[PDB]
Amino acid sequence: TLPPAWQPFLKDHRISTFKNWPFLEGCACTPERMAEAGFIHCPTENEPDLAQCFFCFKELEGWEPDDDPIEEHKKHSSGCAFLSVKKQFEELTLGEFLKLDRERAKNKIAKETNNKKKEFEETAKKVRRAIEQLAA
């Protein structure tokens, strides 16, 4: 059985994340279609339609009914290793799975590193502006 950290590898767990997802029957981006594409629903107040790939951690919003999650995925994160996996999860080898998860662990560090840097740049921008205002 998979611990909380590895649950997102399960399509049915990803599907279950979609609660109050607006795009249902008739739509191309159904919860099932999003999940098959690797997305999980991670809504906020500011963005209630925010979805994120569990593997490469790319976050996308502004979803529209005819959006194809797979295509939006290839488009906005072409290098994602999950996209390369062409077989079902359960036909994966344990070695293969453990490799994929090493990639995923790296993806998360990289993502956490990018955020810390973005935050760092933001803070520096405030300091510079405050210095300029006092330089006047």
């Binding site: 925010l50 790319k58 976050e59 996308l60 919003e61 502004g62 979803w63 959006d67």
Partner: peptide
């Protein structure tokens, strides 16, 4: 859609 597009990037946050």
């Amino acid at each position: 859609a597009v990037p946050i």
